[PDB]
From a paper:
Crystal structures of TadA*8.20 and TADAC-1.17 were determined in a complex with ssDNA substrate containing the adenine transition-state analog 2-deoxy-8-azanebularine (d8Az). These two structures are highly similar, and the four TADAC-1.17 substitutions (T17A, A48G, S82T and A142E) derived from evolution do not drastically alter substrate tolerance by changing the protein structure or the ssDNA binding mode. We hypothesize that the T82 side chain near the catalytic E59 residue (~4 Å) in the active site may have a role in increasing cytosine deamination by modulating proton transfer to or from E59. Additionally, the hydrogen bonding between E142 and R153 may modulate ssDNA binding by stabilizing the α6-helix, as exemplified by the interactions between F156 and dT(8) in the TADAC-1.17 structure.
Numbering used by the authors:
A (entry chain B): 2 to 161
B (entry chain A): 4 to 157
DNA sequence: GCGGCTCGGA
DNA sequence: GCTCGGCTCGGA
């Protein structure tokens, strides 16, 4: 029962952007930055095509959010991403000072929001970013499993 | 290989003065691959409305365009300031070979100070670290920006 | 040594 | 794994 402007509502737009990365032969990850139930930034992985090692879905949304906000600080915003953020994106989330990150499926190998580490809730950091996970995880995992050529029942098998 | 660390750090300090002229954090970075400059950068986050426009990110982005590849193997990144969590993570994704910074970020540094994400176990890539290159001149720029005495920083 | 310190929500 | 390798792009 997904209501408009719910976590699943925004995650489905983020999943629609992940299909764009899939069509572009990239890692099928999409991201949507939401502030007061309004989209201020969208993005998907374009690193291979743009020759940008930082062109992850979360970065493309944060850069767009800063332009839309005319401010490199994006307080009280919520970032939706289909994949658990890496160290790069989680570190960028701290600098933009967003309010929460909502991701779908986990990166059990190198995830930096609970999996390999938790840089967002690291002690000593200038800002703490709240974490919500599991939103449409089955649909986010299906996209990446087909990209990485893996059956779904092996992606994060220890959590199942 | 060819040039010395102080040679390239002198170039990175020149770029940090450009960020200083732009009323930004005076941090500059130069990306070197096979003793040739493939990327330059300085902090431009306030002017570009970019939360990621750190010196290292702008230098790495430029390197990816020059190399037409989002992977920048065997390159060495020079920066006047210890990389943050965001910038250190970008070096892992770019798969650079070494990061050389001058002064340390004792508060939130992610290359030895607050943490070491470059040498974290479990990561796909390990980035070597060299520090202290022209540390006095890198610290002077940030101390004057942060309005702090030199004998307090670190 | 403006406030309080690694941009001003450091 | 109506079987590409080896698994969280192919230097995963
Ligand atoms: Zn990322
Ligand atoms: Zn940085």
């Amino acid at each position: 029962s997904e209501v408009e402007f719910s976590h699943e509502y925004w995650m489905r737009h983020a999943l629609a952007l992940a299909k764009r990365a899939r069509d572009e032969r990239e890692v099928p990850v999409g991201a949507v930055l939401v502030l007061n139930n309004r989209v201020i930034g969208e993005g998907w992985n374009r690193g291979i095509g743009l020759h940008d090692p930082t062109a992850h879905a979360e970065i493309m949304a944060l850069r767009q959010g800063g332009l839309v906000m005319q401010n490199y600080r994006l307080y009280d915003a919520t970032l939706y991403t289909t994949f658990e953020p890496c160290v790069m994106c989680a570190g960028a989330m701290i600098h933009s000072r967003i309010g929460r990150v909502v991701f779908g499926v986990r990166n059990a190998k190198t995830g930096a929001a609970g999996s390999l580490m938790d840089v967002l809730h690291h002690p000593g950091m200038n800002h703490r970013v709240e974490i919500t996970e599991g939103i449409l995880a089955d649909e986010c995992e299906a996209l990446l499993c087909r990209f990485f050529r893996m059956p779904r029942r092996v992606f994060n098998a220890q959590k199942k």
